[PDB]
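pipeline/complex-builder :: batch 7 item 3
reading input block
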Amino acid sequence: DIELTQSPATLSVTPGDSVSLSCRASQSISNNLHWYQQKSHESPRLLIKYVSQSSSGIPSRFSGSGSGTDFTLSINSVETEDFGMYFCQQSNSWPRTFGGGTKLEIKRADAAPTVSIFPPSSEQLTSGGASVVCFLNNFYPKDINVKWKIDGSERQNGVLNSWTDQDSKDSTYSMSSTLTLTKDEYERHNSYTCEATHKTSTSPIVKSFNRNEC
Amino acid sequence: QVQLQESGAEVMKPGASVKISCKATGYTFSTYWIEWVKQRPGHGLEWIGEILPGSGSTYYNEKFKGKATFTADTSSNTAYMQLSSLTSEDSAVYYCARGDGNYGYWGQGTTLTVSSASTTPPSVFPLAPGSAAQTNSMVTLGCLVKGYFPEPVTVTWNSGSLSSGVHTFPAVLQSDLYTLSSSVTVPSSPRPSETVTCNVAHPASSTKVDKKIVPRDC
C-alpha cells in the first residue's frame, strides 16, 4: 500500500497565523493527491484536488502545492472556523488510502477551569448506586489532571471522564469526571474531593463535600 | 444537485448482518464509481472498496475481502454495502461518496453500533449543588442521564430556553449501557427561586423526562 504520512498530528494555531501541513507518500503518486477538511460529526469536505487545484466555494486562504512524495496544504492566515481534521488521500493506485490526519486547534489565552462537585442524588442512592460527578468547565489549555480523593486517599478505579470538543464560540474545553460506587462503598467514607491540576495554577483546584452534610 | 443520501443509524447484534444504502441523485448513477469509507471513533478514514453501478465490477480493500459486499440497483439509483459477521469492531460511521479520483460528493454517513444490549430507557438524576461550595454568583446545576440504550438521548434545559451555559458531555459506555451528563450555569438569582428543569428524551424507548433540580434540603 501507499502509506500516507501527515505531520504534525496536531496543531495549536493562533488566528491570523499561517500554517503548512505535510503529507508524504511511501512512493511517488504524481499529482494524485487531495485534501479534505472534516468538522466534528460531519462528512469530509474536499478543499483542493490534484495537489493544487481549487474548488468553487472554498476560501482562497487554502492552497496546496507539492508533487511526487511531498505535499503541502497551506492556510495563509488561519481563521477561527479552520478548526478540524485535515486529511490527505492518494488516488494513484488500489486500494485508496488516506493520511493519519492533522488535527487543527485554535490557541487562546489560558483560562482556569470552573470546578463543581455533586454528591449522589437520593433517588439514585435508592437504586443502591452512587455516582459522584465533577464538572471542569471552560478551560484552556486542554491539559488537565483530575484526581479523586476519598478521605484524603486517592482513588483510580471507578472514574469515567468525558470531554466536550474545543468550543466554537470561546475556544475553551470542558470535562466531566464521574466516580461510580456501590451505595455501601460510599457510606464507608465521609469526604469526597475533586482536584484539578491546570497550568493556570501552581496549587490544585479542590472542591469537596462531606457525605453527611445536608 | 448531486445528492447522496444514506440510510439511518443501525444497532445490530454481533454475528448479524447489516445492509447500508446510499441513494444517489442529480447525476447519471451508472456513470460513476461509488466508494465506501469506514471511520472508527478517532482512527483516521479507511477505504473499504467501490462499485460501478453500470457494469457491476467491485473492488474491495484486501482487508475487507469477505466482510463487505457491494451491490447496486440501477432502477432506483441505490448502491448497498452489506456487512457480514458483525463484531464489535465493526462499530463505526460509514460513508459512501462518488468516485472521481477525489471525492467531492459524500453521503451524510451511517452509524453502526454492534451490541447485545437492548432498548433500555435512561434513569435521569438531578444534580443539585452540595450545601458546601455552592455559594457563588453563578451556580452550576447538572443532570445525570444513566444507563440507556441505544444512542441518542436529547437534553435541553427549561424546554430549550436555557441555551447559554449548557455543556452536554459525550456519552460513555458503562457495562454496555450509556451514561451522559449535562451542566447549565446560572446566576444564583434564578435558582432555587426560578424552577430549572432538565428535559431528557429517548426516542428509542419513547421516554420523555422533565426532571426538576430541587434544593438539597432533605
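note: The domain at 1-116 of chain B is CATH 2.60.40.10 (Immunoglobulin-like).
queue -> next item
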